[PDB]
Chain A
Amino acid sequence: LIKSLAEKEKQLLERLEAAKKEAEERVKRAEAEAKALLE
């Protein structure tokens, strides 16, 4: 019940990294879309 906070702070960081992955995939997706637009 201190370890529960510890491990879900760890997986809280993991959930932030999941959102981070979603962000960077969206950015390079929009970049490839703009590349097709320029072509």
Chain B
Amino acid sequence: SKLEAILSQEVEAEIQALLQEAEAKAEAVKREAEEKAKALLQARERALEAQYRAALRRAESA
């Protein structure tokens, strides 16, 4: 059936657009949470490192 076979191929193009959005959503979430993983890594590292460093400074000074 010609024209509603074309309508069902538009439906397969909607499947195509949905899997495009699926891969795009997976990569977007992975990228933004990778940014946050590295940022929180460096954040807690440098914060506790600065606390450790200032404790060493004030300890040797005292």
Contact = CB atoms under 8 A, between A and B. Distances in A.
B40 to A, nearest CB: 10
Q: Is the interface of A mostly helix, strand, loop or mixed?
A: helix
Contacts, number: 52
Interface size class of B (residues with CB under 8 A): 20 to 34
Contacts of B15: 15-16, 18-19, 22
Interface string B15-56: 100110011011001100110110000000000000000000
Nearest to B24: A26
Interface residues of A, number: 19
Interface string A1-37: 1001100110110011011001100100110011001
Interface of A: 1, 4-5, 8-9, 11-12, 15-16, 18-19, 22-23, 26, 29-30, 33-34, 37
